[PDB]
Design a protein around this motif. Structure first.
Motif, PDB file in Angstrom:
ATOM      1  N   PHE A 189      26.539  22.191  33.847  1.00  0.00           N
ATOM      2  CA  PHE A 189      25.223  22.034  33.544  1.00  0.00           C
ATOM      3  C   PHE A 189      24.575  20.683  34.228  1.00  0.00           C
ATOM      4  CE2 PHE A 189      25.946  24.156  29.331  1.00  0.00           C
ATOM      5  CZ  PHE A 189      25.857  25.541  29.909  1.00  0.00           C
ATOM      6  N   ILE A 190      25.229  19.867  34.252  1.00  0.00           N
ATOM      7  CA  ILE A 190      24.740  18.600  35.428  1.00  0.00           C
ATOM      8  C   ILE A 190      24.625  19.155  36.814  1.00  0.00           C
ATOM      9  CG2 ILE A 190      26.716  17.373  36.033  1.00  0.00           C
ATOM     10  CD1 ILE A 190      23.584  16.093  34.369  1.00  0.00           C
ATOM     11  N   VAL A 191      25.740  19.967  37.312  1.00  0.00           N
ATOM     12  CA  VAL A 191      25.604  20.570  38.862  1.00  0.00           C
ATOM     13  C   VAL A 191      24.379  21.251  38.842  1.00  0.00           C
ATOM     14  CG1 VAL A 191      26.718  21.727  40.328  1.00  0.00           C
ATOM     15  CG2 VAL A 191      28.033  19.832  39.322  1.00  0.00           C
ATOM     16  N   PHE A 192      24.349  22.279  38.025  1.00  0.00           N
ATOM     17  CA  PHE A 192      23.183  23.040  37.996  1.00  0.00           C
ATOM     18  C   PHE A 192      21.799  22.593  38.051  1.00  0.00           C
ATOM     19  CE2 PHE A 192      25.884  26.915  36.418  1.00  0.00           C
ATOM     20  CZ  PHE A 192      26.155  27.389  37.689  1.00  0.00           C
ATOM     21  N   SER A 193      21.568  21.457  37.155  1.00  0.00           N
ATOM     22  CA  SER A 193      20.598  20.657  37.018  1.00  0.00           C
ATOM     23  C   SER A 193      20.340  19.796  38.608  1.00  0.00           C
ATOM     24  CB  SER A 193      20.462  19.606  35.859  1.00  0.00           C
ATOM     25  OG  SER A 193      20.605  20.352  34.820  1.00  0.00           O
ATOM     26  N   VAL A 194      21.247  19.198  38.920  1.00  0.00           N
ATOM     27  CA  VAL A 194      21.296  18.654  40.243  1.00  0.00           C
ATOM     28  C   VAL A 194      20.678  19.694  41.169  1.00  0.00           C
ATOM     29  CG1 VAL A 194      22.547  17.714  41.978  1.00  0.00           C
ATOM     30  CG2 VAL A 194      22.935  16.761  39.979  1.00  0.00           C
ATOM     31  N   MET A 195      21.311  20.775  41.229  1.00  0.00           N
ATOM     32  CA  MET A 195      20.811  21.847  42.010  1.00  0.00           C
ATOM     33  C   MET A 195      19.322  22.109  41.812  1.00  0.00           C
ATOM     34  SD  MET A 195      23.097  22.473  44.199  1.00  0.00           S
ATOM     35  CE  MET A 195      24.894  21.908  44.675  1.00  0.00           C
ATOM     36  N   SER A 196      18.762  22.100  40.855  1.00  0.00           N
ATOM     37  CA  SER A 196      17.531  22.413  40.461  1.00  0.00           C
ATOM     38  C   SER A 196      16.731  21.433  41.185  1.00  0.00           C
ATOM     39  CB  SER A 196      17.102  22.232  38.932  1.00  0.00           C
ATOM     40  OG  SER A 196      17.379  23.666  38.137  1.00  0.00           O
ATOM     41  N   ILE A 197      17.080  20.065  41.079  1.00  0.00           N
ATOM     42  CA  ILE A 197      16.283  19.053  41.617  1.00  0.00           C
ATOM     43  C   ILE A 197      16.369  19.084  43.207  1.00  0.00           C
ATOM     44  CG2 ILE A 197      16.536  16.339  41.932  1.00  0.00           C
ATOM     45  CD1 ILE A 197      17.831  16.280  39.359  1.00  0.00           C
ATOM     46  N   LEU A 198      17.701  19.139  43.926  1.00  0.00           N
ATOM     47  CA  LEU A 198      17.784  19.474  45.190  1.00  0.00           C
ATOM     48  C   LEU A 198      16.988  20.578  45.628  1.00  0.00           C
ATOM     49  CD1 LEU A 198      21.736  18.883  45.362  1.00  0.00           C
ATOM     50  CD2 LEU A 198      19.955  17.338  45.897  1.00  0.00           C
ATOM     51  N   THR A 199      17.019  21.669  44.966  1.00  0.00           N
ATOM     52  CA  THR A 199      16.319  23.006  45.390  1.00  0.00           C
ATOM     53  C   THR A 199      14.759  22.776  45.439  1.00  0.00           C
ATOM     54  OG1 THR A 199      18.024  24.507  44.522  1.00  0.00           O
ATOM     55  CG2 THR A 199      15.788  25.306  44.993  1.00  0.00           C
ATOM     56  N   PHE A 200      14.221  21.889  44.466  1.00  0.00           N
ATOM     57  CA  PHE A 200      12.951  21.632  44.291  1.00  0.00           C
ATOM     58  C   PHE A 200      12.500  20.771  45.350  1.00  0.00           C
ATOM     59  CE2 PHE A 200       9.443  18.715  42.936  1.00  0.00           C
ATOM     60  CZ  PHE A 200       8.578  19.739  42.333  1.00  0.00           C
TER      61      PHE A 200
END
Ligand SMILES: CCCCCCCCCO[C@@H]1O[C@H](CO)[C@@H](O)[C@H](O)[C@H]1O
Ligand SMILES: CCCCCCCCCO[C@@H]1O[C@H](CO)[C@@H](O)[C@H](O)[C@H]1O
Ligand SMILES: CCCCCCCCCO[C@@H]1O[C@H](CO)[C@@H](O)[C@H](O)[C@H]1O
Ligand SMILES: CCCCCCCCCO[C@@H]1O[C@H](CO)[C@@H](O)[C@H](O)[C@H]1O
Ligand SMILES: CCCCCCCCCO[C@@H]1O[C@H](CO)[C@@H](O)[C@H](O)[C@H]1O
Ligand SMILES: CCCCCCCCCO[C@@H]1O[C@H](CO)[C@@H](O)[C@H](O)[C@H]1O
Ligand SMILES: CCCCCCCCCO[C@@H]1O[C@H](CO)[C@@H](O)[C@H](O)[C@H]1O
Ligand SMILES: CCCCCCCCCO[C@@H]1O[C@H](CO)[C@@H](O)[C@H](O)[C@H]1O
Ligand SMILES: OC[C@H]1O[C@H](CO)[C@@H](O)[C@@H]1O
Ligand SMILES: OC[C@H]1O[C@H](CO)[C@@H](O)[C@@H]1O
Lengths: 478, 477
Positions: free
Chosen positions: B436-447
């Protein structure tokens, strides 16, 4: 001679090989599927029971019905190309071989065999037409015999690979099949995937051009010039472009008059040549050839054992393959009508004495020996005549305006008559062979007189001509 | 609900089959596990190692087939868009038939491989067909119809599996119900009937091809005809000129031999290509297919069977209902705005769950937070990234590589599905906090990637991209 024409026709003969191999490979190993799939696991005997007969009948109905459908759809697929149809055939058979090889139930393999019969139906129309339009007109028949030549080699190869196997699963036995059996039957099913890939390679690497007739017919006149110059091996190719140019002018004239195949059937001149083709193609199955191909085992099961039937199948199919070669020289030297009538004679020579002998004494040893050798007569006659000559003929007997559609209809009739003949013949040969063989003798003589009176010679004609409809009997009306 | 709507719905039937074939296997898988008896050699008839191995293979076959289908659809679509739809329909008719009569792991694996090939065909063909059968001002609104019916297909797939009892127990040995042995094959076959419906719809009413393609291939008067048919006005010279410029750029590009790999050597094109690949593949790092593919595996630990039934039903229904607002928002706000808000939503979903699992892994409230966060993620994806990606990929490329680059990006989406779902299936089994922290990091990076790199594409003429300008497309070599 081994010309460029010959290389291209050989390129299509891979699809022909897949044709034959898929026609016979099911019968090669069907005992092992009956045992492995446990179709008769309730009865005492595992190879013969009610269930096996029922489902094995459907596994042939699939091939024949799918071939009906595939010949029917070949007319609309070839509309979009000949070489395309060869690539579709190869890419199709690759996957159908995979699927056939991985099925673990009667339904999945029934589906896969129906697809395989559809591939058969495509090949039947596509390869002979491709050879018809990719060859020197003088050699149309010599190279069209190559179609059936490679069909026969496919059957023979399928029979030869099965001998790498154990040559039988004990029927009375409760013994499970050998690992090598359980593998090699699937491998035999899959081999045509390799062959399909080989055909695709040859089409895409070396033989990229389509048939000159088609290219000229679709507006690419200079690609027509190029590939015709390539099959004829010369920069001077006026006369074949005249053949193609006039046949294509005829195609577009007919399409301006809206001469669909149905509209031509309302025209007597076209209807006569069409129905002649339909009947000549439907009569090829009244030899019972697929009665022998489908039930090569079931026929001789009354009076022969496994080893002799193995050897019989081998030499029978090999003789079939070796007797197509002479047809290459005969179809051109003699003519198609000639070789056809001689085929009728051979088949009558085969059938009439078996009918007579069975009428004398069905249970006679002389009758059994005579059955073996009369079968070989039917084969030597069929392989050197009707087999090759029908697929040569069908793509030379039709005017250019319905050449492609009429051929597909006649091939469809071929497979429909296969349905008509093979499945009842295995009932009657069981009940009273005399009825069967006297009917086949009468059909030999009937077909003889039909071909003699109605069927005209077709050797040497340019592309898109018919001896049945002169030039003026077709442009002005169509 | 103009004529363009009729044509796009004709294409969206294929989208329905897409979604259906995607989730139908997962809906009824217990039943097949019992019939095919993959885990009978143990005490537990539903849960064993062989099942894990072979089920992973079935999903991977679908993904690989989708890769192959998109890559091949790139080469297929040049012979026709409506043709691609026809081939897809016939294909799925026979593949649904075969999938329905399979009795072994191998035949059904092969069937799902082909189903994935058709999946990949759809992924590229349908968004393009809608792209070229609609008003330039309504490309996005009608492009949501694609994902709208995709989600509707998943919903139908899960819904039909409820007509079954879901009584293939792990602890039981009772043979499956006759209706049960029947209904999952009927579900695999239903897309055959639906394929027939789609073929009928295409061949009867919606016979014409897309104006863009017709003009690309010479049928100018038929281009004019179908253009006036979708637009309901005859003097539509402006779309004809958009097509004329894009198609003239296409013909001039082929004049200089511009294939996709040739564009990769020119930086101007390579930039927009890698932007497309990255935006398309980043849709999978939302963890959406981890949830779709392993929906049961996530909640079998803290949820009961009936509770999983209702949870799956309602979250899939929410996916379908929340794909609707995109139809209006994509056109009202734009794609970049909606994408960035989608990243926001996905982070809102994952990050609380990520921190919560480190707080107390076995908390009664962490389960509830995960349910609510699941719905947050579902709502976030269904209304933004899901619909918006397939709209974006068919407006952001110059026409010289419009279809080819669109196919490449759609392929990359499926490759990233493989890169995410399976490592996710293994990681979520160990430590949800890390995933979940990696998917959140990916949310930030994608943003931030969208924020800084990705430009708005709304209202661009067909064959127009905000990344490369018309005169730049001319830049002679
Ligand atoms: C073209 C190939 C089509 C083959 C399938 C045709 C329909 C067969 C009827 O269904 C069969 O009913 C049986 C129980 O009644 C099942 O044991 C079997 O699994 C199932 O298939
Ligand atoms: C307008 C006609 C042009 C098409 C013929 C171009 C050369 C041959 C291409 O055949 C290829 O055969 C493969 C089989 O593996 C297919 O997978 C692949 O998709 C296909 O491209
Ligand atoms: C053009 C109008 C429609 C034609 C109608 C078909 C009957 C006429 C075809 O002539 C046929 O010629 C053969 C010579 O080879 C004869 O043996 C045969 O008896 C004869 O039937
Ligand atoms: C022109 C007609 C040619 C008929 C050839 C049809 C071949 C099908 C016969 O099957 C045979 O079954 C045996 C086991 O039963 C095998 O040992 C043998 O290898 C196989 O050949
Ligand atoms: C379309 C047939 C292909 C040619 C085959 C020629 C004869 C095959 C032998 O038949 C079998 O031998 C006896 C008659 O010879 C019958 O008593 C027996 O029931 C029959 O099964
Ligand atoms: C947007 C997220 C969509 C997720 C939908 C995934 C559907 C597959 C989950 O399987 C569920 O398991 C039950 C038995 O295992 C079935 O009875 C139920 O019908 C099914 O839904
Ligand atoms: C197994 C189900 C039956 C499958 C039959 C496939 C449909 C036939 C191919 O489609 C036709 O192709 C033409 C392309 O030019 C179109 O003109 C025409 O409108 C379209 O209908
Ligand atoms: C792609 C992910 C979709 C959103 C994630 C929320 C729904 C799944 C919740 O995970 C499950 O619930 C708890 C996490 O709170 C853990 O105890 C458990 O191990 C984990 O399996
Ligand atoms: O040669 C044997 C096969 O060829 C015919 C077609 O030419 C088929 O019916 C037959 O099974
Ligand atoms: O409903 C969500 C679905 O949309 C995505 C494709 O855009 C799929 O991965 C997912 O199953």
């Amino acid at each position: 001679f081994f010309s460029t024409s010959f290389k291209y026709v050989l390129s299509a003969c891979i699809a022909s090989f897949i044709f034959g191999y898929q026609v016979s490979v099911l019968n090669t190993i069907k005992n092992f599927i009956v045992v492995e799939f446990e179709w008769c696991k309730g009865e005492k005997d595992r190879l013969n029971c009610s269930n096996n007969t029922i489902q094995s009948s459907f596994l042939l109905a699939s091939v024949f019905i799918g071939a009906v459908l595939g010949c029917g759809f070949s007319g609309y697929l070839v509309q979009f190309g000949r070489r395309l149809s060869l690539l579709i055939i190869y890419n199709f058979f690759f996957l159908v071989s995979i699927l056939t090889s991985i099925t673990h139930h009667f339904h999945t393999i029934l589906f896969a065999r129906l697809l395989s019969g559809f591939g058969i139906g495509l090949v039947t129309v596509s390869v002979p037409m491709y050879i018809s339009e990719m060859t020197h007109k003088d050699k149309k028949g010599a190279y069209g015999v190559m179609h059936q030549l490679f069909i026969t080699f496919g059957i023979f190869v399928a029979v030869m690979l099965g001998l790498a196997m154990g040559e039988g699963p004990k029927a009375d036995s409760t013994e499970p099949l050998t690992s090598f059996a359980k593998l090699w039957w699937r491998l035999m099913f899959l081999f045509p995937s390799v062959i399909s890939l080989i055909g695709i390679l040859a089409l895409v690497v070396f033989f990229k051009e389509e048939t000159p007739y088609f290219l000229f017919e679709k507006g690419r006149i200079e690609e027509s010039k190029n590939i015709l110059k390539k099959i004829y091996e010369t920069d001077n190719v006026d006369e074949p472009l005249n053949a193609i140019k006039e046949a294509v002018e005829q195609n577009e004239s007919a399409k301006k008059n809206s001469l669909s195949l149905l509209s031509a059937l309302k025209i007597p001149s076209y209807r006569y040549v069409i129905i002649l083709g339909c009947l000549l193609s439907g009569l090829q199955q009244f030899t019972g050839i697929n009665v022998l191909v489908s039930n090569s085992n079931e026929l001789y099961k009354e009076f022969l054992d496994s080893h002799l039937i193995t050897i019989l199948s081998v030499v029978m199919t090999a003789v079939n393959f070796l007797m197509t070669f002479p047809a290459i020289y005969i179809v051109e030297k003699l003519g198609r009508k000639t070789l056809l009538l001689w085929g009728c004679v051979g088949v009558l020579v085969a059938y009439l004495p078996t009918a007579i002998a069975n009428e004398i004494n069905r249970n006679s040893n002389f009758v059994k020996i005579l059955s073996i050798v009369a079968t070989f007569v039917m084969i030597i006659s069929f392989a050197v005549s009707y087999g090759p000559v029908l697929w040569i003929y069908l793509h030379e007997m039709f005017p250019s305006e319905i050449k492609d559609s009429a051929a597909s209809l006649a091939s469809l009739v071929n497979w429909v008559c296969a349905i008509i003949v093979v499945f009842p013949s295995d009932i009657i040969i069981k009940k009273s062979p005399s009825i069967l063989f006297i009917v086949f003798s009468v059909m030999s003589i009937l077909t003889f007189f039909f071909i003699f009176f109605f069927i005209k010679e077709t050797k040497g004609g340019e592309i898109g001509t018919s001896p049945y409809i002169t030039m003026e009997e077709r442009q002005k009306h169509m």
